[PDB]
């Protein structure tokens, strides 16, 4: 019982792009860009579409870097999140009524204002490592348990 979601990180040699979500699920947190995958759409095509819709950026090369399964205790549907990375983008990030993008230096990642699991796998993403993770949450702020491992193939 799961649903597909995408998560895209624009990671350049000295900075990473994150977006502050204004409303709905995850509002008030910085995260990468993404969302649900459409019927008849590949996961990578959904990731590209969502990056454009939310950041205003155009991407050509997306690299699969991780898969994270999120469970919220008491919620039947697991979130199967496919994580992607890109260093090659076109355009400038756009602020909209749904999203406020901002560039962060790699030593200034705003972990206190991100989902709490990010503190675990973001250091792997920064060291160009690929991973599989599972995080069990009680509400939106508490990690009850988790698994996280580096993989060669996502
Ligand atoms: C704006 N985005 C990226 C989405 O709407 C899809 C989505 C939403 C939330 C999460 C997510 N990210 C992280 N880092 N931690 C989470 C913890 C629990 C649930 C979702 C989480 C991933 C993709």
UniProtKB/Swiss-Prot annotation:
GO terms for cellular component: cytoplasm; cytosol; mitochondrial matrix; mitochondrion; nucleus. Changing residue 149 to A: Reduces 2-oxo-dATPase and 8-oxo-dGTPase activities and increases thermolability. Its EC number is 3.6.1.56, 3.6.1.-. Changing residue 115 to A: Greatly reduces or abolishes 2-oxo-dATPase and 8-oxo-dGTPase activities. Widely expressed with highest expression in thymus, testis, embryo and proliferating blood lymphocytes. InterPro entries: 8ODP, Nudix_hydrolase, NUDIX_hydrolase-like_dom_sf, NUDIX_hydrolase_CS, NUDIX_hydrolase_dom. 8-oxo-dGTP binds at residues 6, 21, 31, 33-36, 115-118. Binds 2 Mg(2+) ion per subunit. Changing residue 152 to A: Enhances 2-oxo-dATPase and 8-oxo-dGTPase activities and increases thermolability. Mg(2+) 1 binds at residues 34, 54, 98. This is Oxidized purine nucleoside triphosphate hydrolase. It comes from Homo sapiens (Human). The gene is NUDT1.
